[PDB]
Structure formats: C-alpha cells, structure tokens
Design a binder for this molecule. Structure first.
Ligand SMILES: Nc1ncnc2c1ncn2[C@@H]1O[C@H](COP(=O)(O)OP(=O)(O)OP(=O)(O)O)[C@@H](O)[C@H]1O
Ligand SMILES: Nc1ncnc2c1ncn2[C@@H]1O[C@H](COP(=O)(O)OP(=O)(O)OP(=O)(O)O)[C@@H](O)[C@H]1O
Ligand SMILES: [Mg+2]
Ligand SMILES: [Mg+2]
Ligand SMILES: [Mn+2]
Ligand SMILES: [Mn+2]
Ligand SMILES: [Zn+2]
Ligand SMILES: [Zn+2]
Lengths: 356, 348
DNA sequence: ATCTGTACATGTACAGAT
DNA sequence: ATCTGTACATGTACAGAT
DNA sequence: ATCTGTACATGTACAGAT
DNA sequence: ATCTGTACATGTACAGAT
C-alpha cells in the first residue's frame, strides 16, 4: 500500500513518453543514417534499443535512453584479458574498413571509439531542430552520450558494439542459470543469439587499456525482462500479474535516491541492482513467489539479498560467473558498509527516502 | 498400473528408430534433391518434417513418417469455398497448372514415381493413389513395413486467412506472445483430393497447420520448463498416445470406424489442453483421471456431433457431411464399453 | 527493361489513460 | 472495465540503380 | 546457393539408488 | 515398485565456408 503509492510516483506519464520519444527517435535515426553514408568505417552498423526504457523499468521520468549501434564483425579471435572473464582483446586474421583501427591485428577500442565519436560530434553540429549536445567523455563508458534539452533534460547513450555471431565465450558457459526458471529451450535459444563487445575505455593506466573490450548482454537482459515468468502467461492479458518488475523499480529507486544524496555511493550503479534481482528471480522462480499482494515481502527479500551481497562482497555477473561486481578491486569495503548501513536504515524506518 | 504398462508396450525401440530413420532419410533426401537438382516446376521446394514421429507421439513402431515439401509462392489470391473455413481456390514456373491442386499433385506425383524407379538399394514402391489424400505415399519394405507420406504444400507468407482469426485459442495456456509469434509464421495449403464428384473438387486446396501443431506438441506447457530436464514431467503426450492407441485398436477391428483418423484424437486433445491449461492438471500421478476425462470429452464430441478444427473453428470435423451419425454412435458405444470394462482392447 | 536497399504497411503486447 | 501511444517484428513497394 | 559442423533438445535403455 | 544418472540415438537450428 505504501509501496503501491511509490510505484504511482515512479510511473511514467504517456505525455512525457510521447515528447521524449519523438525527439530521441529523430536524433537516433539521423545519427544511424550518417554512419551508413560514404566510406564510413561503420557502414552497416545496426540499431538495438536496450536498457530500462525499453524493458519498461525506467522510473520517475523518460529522461535516459540506451541505444546500441552494433556492427557485425566476422572471423574473430578473442583473447581473454588475464582470466577476468569479462574483458577481451579482439583480433583479426584476414589482413577491411576497420583497417585504420587495427594495430598488429589487435583491434583498438579507443581508436575505434574516437572515430565513432568524432562522426557523432559532427552530425550533432548539423541539428538545428532540437537543442542537443555531446557530453564530455566519461571514463569507463563505452558510450557517446547526448544531452537533449527538450526543454526537459534527456540523456541518450549511443553505445558502440562489436557483434559476433559465433558461440559465446567459454567464460559464460556456467552463466545464465535460467534452467529451473525460463528453462533449457529458452537458454539454448538465447545462447544462439549473437554476443557483443563494447569498449572498456578505462583510464586506469594499465596494460592493453585502449584495446580491451568488455562483453555485453543487454539484448539478452531485455528479453529476460520482457519474458520473466516461469509461466508463458505471466503479466499477459489472459494471465496473472506478478510484481517482479515493480520490485526492480523500487530497488532501482532506493539506489537513485541514495546516490543523489551521498557521493560515497559513486561506485554503485543500477546494474548492480539489476544483477542482484536476476539472481533473486533465479532463486525464486515460481510466479507465485512474485504475487502483487506480497510486494512488501518480495521487496524485503530483495533488500535482504542485496545486503548479503554487500556484506559478503560478492555479486557475481549473471552472465559471467567468475566476475564479481563487488570485488575489493572495484568497490571499497568502506563504500559497501556505508551503503549497507543506508539500506538497513531505510528498511527499518519506513523508507523515508521514498518521500523526497 | 495398467496404463503405465500399456505405455511400455507402445514405446518405440531405439534400435527400430535408427533403422527406420536412416532408410527413410535416404529416400526423402533423394526425392527432395530431384525436385530442384533436376529442373522442375518445384525447384524451390524445402523439406518440413511433421506428424507423430517428429512430435514424439508415434506409438508401437516407427512405421509411418510425414514430410511436407513446401513451395514458396508470392502473390496468391485466396478465395474461400462456400464459407467452409478450410478449403480455398488459389489464384495469382507453375504456369502449367486458378491453380489446380489435381494438376499440380499429378506432376509432383509423376516426378516421385520416376525417381522411385531409380532406387536400387531400398525396397520401395509408390502406393496407389487414395482419393482424399494430399500425399504421395511410399511403401518401404525394410524387413519391416514403413509408410512415408510426401505431402505437397504451398507456402504463403501473408496474414493467416480470416477464418482462422478465432482459431488457435492458446491465450490462457501458451499465451498471447506465443500466439502472435506463431501467427507470424507462414501458412500452408495442401490438396483436397476427394473423388466425391462435387463442384470445384479438383482445384480446391486445404489449409494445413502441421508446422504449428509440431511446435505445440513440443512446447505444450504453461510453464516454460514442462517436460525439460530441470522441469517436471507432465502426462500430456502419454494421454495422446493412449487415446491414439484406443482408436487404432478399434479401427483395426471395426470397418465401421473407417471415417475416423488419429487427427480427430489430436484435435480433441488440443481442445482439452486449452480447457485444462495448468501443468498440474496433467500430473503423471493422475494419468488415469486425465485419460478418462479425455475419453469423456471425446464421447461428448461424438454425442453432440461437434469437433471443431482447432485452427478453423467453423469447420466441424464431426459434421454429418463428413462422418455419418451411425458411425459416431457406433464409436460411442465401443469407447463407452472399453472404458467401463478396464480397456480389454489394450491386451492384444 | 529488371533488380533491390529503404522505408512504408500491418498487427499486437505492453502498459498508461480514461 | 476499455481505449490508446509506443516499440517492434515481419511483409512488401518502389525510386533509383543497374 | 548448398553443404558440413556444432550444440543440445527430444527420445530410449539400463543399472544402481530409492 | 519408482527415481536418478549415464550412455546412446535422432532431429533441428543456424553459423560459416564453399
Ligand atoms: N557495469 C555494467 N556492466 C555490464 N553491463 C552494463 C553495465 N552498466 C550498464 N550495462 C548495460 O547497459 C544497459 C544500460 O545501462 P544504464 O546505466 O542506462 O542502466 P539501465 O539498466 O538502462 O537503467 P537506468 O538508466 O534507468 O539506471 C544496462 O541495462 C545493461 O544492460
Ligand atoms: N484431416 C486432417 N485435417 C488436417 N490436417 C490433417 C488431417 N489429417 C492429418 N493432418 C495433418 O497431417 C499430419 C500427419 O497425419 P497422420 O495421419 O500421419 O497423423 P499423425 O499425427 O502423424 O499420427 P499417426 O500417423 O501416428 O496416426 C497430422 O499430424 C496433421 O498435421
Ligand atoms: Mg538506462
Ligand atoms: Mg505419422
Ligand atoms: Mn545509460
Ligand atoms: Mn500420414
Ligand atoms: Zn510477470
Ligand atoms: Zn510436459
């Protein structure tokens, strides 16, 4: 009941969706068409909408959109980067429009992202229809972010991605454990879909920095978000409603509110809560464990689970099991205890941050 | 007890499956290669395996196989046949054939017969044409007899015809997303090859949805995991197997049941799977009740002379025009008997 | 004259609006 | 409840290319 | 255009555990 | 008696090579 009214606050307004989507789709279409023109290195690039807005778990406002510009790259050798599971060097063996980005048969991520970015930058200069600029490059981001002033502020992440149609890399063999939940036939089909490589683009200063790519499964996550039940009819018009997406929204919101206030929580992002809930959905596969009447206990067990990930410093990648998003090397124990305290406090005092 | 033991009988044997399959595959591959690799009117024909053996509901022996050779054909105009639902005249390589089903089936058939004469490593003949069949049936004699039905089909890639719009009522069982996806697939037209001497008989084709029934048979649960290695087993296919056995055993004995076929049983259980969508209503521990409630549904179809095409609801497979009222009363009394006496026919 | 990448045309699940 | 805008999958038309 | 290679679903068969 | 786990077999989807 309290949680029901929070979800009401979080609910997107169709009027805002129309105005935001109209602008966003103009700018994305124009950008996609420029990449196809002339001798462009990214001719053939294809669009793929991903992220919360296209999963229907975008909360508060339609003000951040994620778009993959995926490029199919045949004949690819992968070199795993120091057994991390998630990061790869990409190599060709043909000796090609990616020519300028090669580097001794190693594909440079930062060279390829720079050229990509320069093209976007130039195309944006030509838009005098809407108030759109390109954000200053943020480190770690595989994106070229647009800031649209639609009056209202709207971020768009154009994510550059390599597309391989081969079988997924062995580090993902034990990942995507949906057998007891969405089943083996779904798992086999999902894994026949391509996999993607986005540039890691770190600033750290470490070996291979500009040639390290990171795996991406936003397309699979989008499918799972929109086909999330053990029963084929979950949330359909002739089926029963579950509260799975609603729990994701409330936990996304707890993390946004907290991250808005405290800069201690910079290391944390929404993908942390998105990953934790895929694990919850696997742990509790049955649609009856996500009954809308038990929204409270469902939201509570998700916090209990998230709190155990923080304290034990373990949140495995859903697709790459050996990859721990809460490792010491990525997030300080300080940062984890701090967030643990803040969650425990919201939990046990009636979620006062839900009222700001 | 007893039903479990009957299903042990009806189970195919791994040995028999590989001997039948490798011989059937030799013949179908050669036939299929001829339809294109020799320049013929069916140059773009593609193979599509259908029926009980490929749905894993074939019983007793692997001795009947069903194959569609489907041919893509852009820009066909469909015309319904007297609001029958399932029968249509087709209009616009094929030039030699209003696209006449008889005329195309005959050449298709001529081509098969020619190739079968060039097969000197398999004992295989072409069965005499049955009016009423859209198939070219091959009789293969391994030490065992094996029927293969080669079914000619047109493949259309538009919307399904209006008569199906109320069909496939899987919304509360397999769901809306599955229904929309299935209905994005092509639909198929096969020949209506009856001898009845009625109006347009020779040019009429019949809708086929074997490709859709294959998916349903192999994606039949409300839960995605039904019958998977990390799911629960249901007894849905075993009920189909048993109801199929009962009709096969009766037809073998009683000439009066000639007008019945397994597709009646298959159609009835689709309706029951829609009426009872929950996987737990098909728990293996309730095989007897499930089989019995399927028997009672089938007897209620007979009593009321009503068994609508699962995909084409206004087509009543149990109409008077297709099956005589006497035939249905005859089958009602036979099933009611077997049911009330512990299925004697299951012991022979 | 025919071929074909691009975009229109069609249908509907999702979920916000009324 | 029903009505309705967006996203998205797939079929098809045709200007411009050949 | 056609074909092989790969992965894993669907099955059966049987022994050891229940 | 059934359940579980391994071995054995065929079907089918699609990537990549030719
Ligand atoms: N750290 C990450 N590791 C892997 N994939 C990530 C990561 N961050 C984001 N992604 C992928 O990119 C998508 C877009 O990221 P983004 O930060 O916009 O979050 P979101 O899930 O769309 O939600 P929101 O924008 O509302 O916070 C994610 O849904 C996920 O698929
Ligand atoms: N009367 C019919 N109307 C429509 N489709 C039919 C009809 N009879 C058969 N079919 C289609 O052709 C397929 C093959 O028919 P067939 O008689 O071999 O049955 P089956 O399902 O293969 O089972 P079995 O051969 O074991 O009796 C069917 O499964 C169905 O898709
Ligand atoms: Mg986002
Ligand atoms: Mg058959
Ligand atoms: Mn983003
Ligand atoms: Mn047949
Ligand atoms: Zn749901
Ligand atoms: Zn099942």
């Amino acid at each position: 009941d309290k949680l029901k009214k929070v979800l009401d606050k979080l609910r997107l307004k169709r009027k805002d969706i129309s105005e935001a989507a109209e602008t966003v789709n103009k700018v994305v279409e124009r950008l996609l068409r420029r990449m196809q023109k002339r001798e462009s290195e990214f001719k053939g690039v294809e669009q793929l909408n991903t992220g919360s807005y296209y999963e229907h778990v975008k909360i508060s406002a339609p003000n951040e959109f994620d778009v993959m510009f995926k490029l199919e790259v045949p004949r690819i050798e992968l070199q795993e980067y120091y057994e991390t599971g998630a990061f790869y060097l990409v190599k060709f063996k043909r000796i090609n429009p990616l020519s300028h980005f090669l580097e001794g048969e190693v594909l440079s991520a930062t060279k390829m992202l720079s050229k990509f970015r320069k093209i976007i930058k130039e195309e944006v200069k030509e838009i005098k229809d809407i108030d759109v600029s390109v954000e200053k490059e943020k480190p770690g981001s595989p994106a070229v972010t647009l800031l649209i002033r639609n009056p209202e502020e709207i971020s768009v992440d154009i994510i550059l991605a390599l597309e391989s149609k081969g079988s997924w890399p062995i580090s993902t063999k034990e990942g995507l454990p949906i057998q007891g939940w969405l089943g083996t036939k779904v798992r086999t089909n999902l894994r026949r879909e391509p996999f993607y490589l986005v540039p890691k683009n770190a600033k750290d200063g470490n070996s291979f920095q500009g040639e390290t790519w990171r795996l991406s499964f936003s397309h699979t996550e989008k499918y799972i978000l929109n086909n999330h039940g053990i029963e084929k009819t979950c949330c359909e018009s002739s089926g029963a409603k579950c509260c799975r997406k609603e729990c994701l929204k409330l936990m996304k919101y707890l993390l946004e509110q907290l991250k808005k206030e405290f800069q201690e929580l910079d290391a944390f992002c929404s993908y942390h809560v998105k990953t934790a809930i895929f694990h919850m959905w696997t742990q509790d596969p049955q649609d009856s464990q996500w009954d809308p009447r038990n929204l409270s206990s469902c939201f509570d067990k998700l916090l209990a689970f998230f709190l155990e990930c923080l304290r034990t410093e373990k949140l495995d990648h859903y697709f790459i099991p050996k990859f721990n998003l809460f490792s010491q090397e990525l997030i300080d124990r300080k940062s984890k205890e701090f967030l643990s305290k803040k969650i425990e406090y919201e939990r046990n005092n009636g979620f006062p941050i839900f009222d700001k």
